Design a protein around this ligand. Sequence first.
Ligand SMILES: CC(C)N(C)S(=O)(=O)c1cc(-c2n[nH]c(=O)n2-c2ccccc2F)c(O)cc1O
Ligand SMILES: CC(C)N(C)S(=O)(=O)c1cc(-c2n[nH]c(=O)n2-c2ccccc2F)c(O)cc1O
Lengths: 208, 208
Amino acid sequence: EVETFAFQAEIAQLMSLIINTFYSNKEIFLRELISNSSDALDKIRYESLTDPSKLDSGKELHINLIPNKQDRTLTIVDTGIGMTKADLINNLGTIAKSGTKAFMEALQAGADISMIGQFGVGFYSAYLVAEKVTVITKHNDDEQYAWESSAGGSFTVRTDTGEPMGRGTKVILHLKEDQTEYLEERRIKEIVKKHSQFIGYPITLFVE
Amino acid sequence: EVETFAFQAEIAQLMSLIINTFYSNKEIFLRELISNSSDALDKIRYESLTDPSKLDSGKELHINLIPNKQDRTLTIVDTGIGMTKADLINNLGTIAKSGTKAFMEALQAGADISMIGQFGVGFYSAYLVAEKVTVITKHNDDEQYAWESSAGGSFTVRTDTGEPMGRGTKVILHLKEDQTEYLEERRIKEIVKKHSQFIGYPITLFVE
Ligand SMILES: CC(C)N(C)S(=O)(=O)c1cc(-c2n[nH]c(=O)n2-c2ccccc2F)c(O)cc1O
Ligand SMILES: CC(C)N(C)S(=O)(=O)c1cc(-c2n[nH]c(=O)n2-c2ccccc2F)c(O)cc1O
């Protein structure tokens, strides 16, 4: 059922860098994930102009933010194009290798972790606030997969023998014990207001 | 040979806004075009991981900046994925309509023309410095096309019965009489240094 993969050397090095560097402006993770959601939503919206049958798996194009104080998780849901088994494993491993090298070269030359997105490696900023990340994704042309990683050099991929979602990506952030502020309504609102105000899709913050 | 199209109402309105608004920080056009080149280069690099035969039309992934004082043109060449007849006409017309609406709504609420890229309509900033724009593009799965526009509500598309380029996009900016500074070596270098320093591809400024 569950397949285990070692991260490429440079990616594993970037994650250790993000987990061990003292950096207080951790809030940047939300903008990076929202921006990735928005790009998946654009990818599906564009593919639907030439082939209107790609919106069969969901007509609605949006982003949902779901805090869960009990489970200590923050979930970012989108109905974007989603990702295939190949994207999760190979594709987002090969494209990452290039940008990871450039970003660490930049940080060496005194750059900021807040610049991570300029290198296409914005996802890894989730390890600033999360101890484990679970990604549930579904692309039209493949099955539903669960990607998971607590860093430490490896990630797992399995078929999601769980509740089905129509086309999209659901990112589950299992927060570190001291990062519970990102489960607070006014805090999420504050971050979204200052970093993701100009997103071309509706962003709905869920209440508890 | 030559097909003439009317721009969608909102796009034609955005171009009039950019051509008529007094705005001195015109230099932003270069970053917007370079960033679009870089995204075309990423699109081809990613499509080449799953299908290595897409790099048959050129192995090299780069951006070339070519000033021509005689012709009063600045050319931005890339070897990115390129664009089809459909992209030039329909696809980049429909996706633009959404972002154009959002950007003008933002500018009404006191936003800056320098924010144009956040709306995916960064291309139209070329009309800050250019009186006419010629786009020569070539995608693997279509022929070579020439797109042209001096704004004024219309653009032209024709098959390029000219010298063939392998996969990519070549943007030719016919500069306004008072925008010749963008043909100067030190000026282009200055703009590239401060706005496009973290591009994941080699940018070569051509000498004259
Ligand atoms: C496991 C993966 C590392 N992520 C959770 S992710 O990349 O941050 C991420 C990816 C997508 C996504 N779906 N389809 C698609 O193309 N993308 C995508 C978008 C932009 C860049 C790279 C990408 F693949 C998303 O909707 C949200 C995300 O948080
Ligand atoms: C006529 C068109 C309006 N442009 C000259 S452009 O969009 O600025 C522009 C487009 C491409 C391009 N080639 N393939 C591709 O997908 N793109 C693309 C990239 C990003 C966004 C939208 C896009 F189509 C490019 O390499 C350079 C550009 O200056």
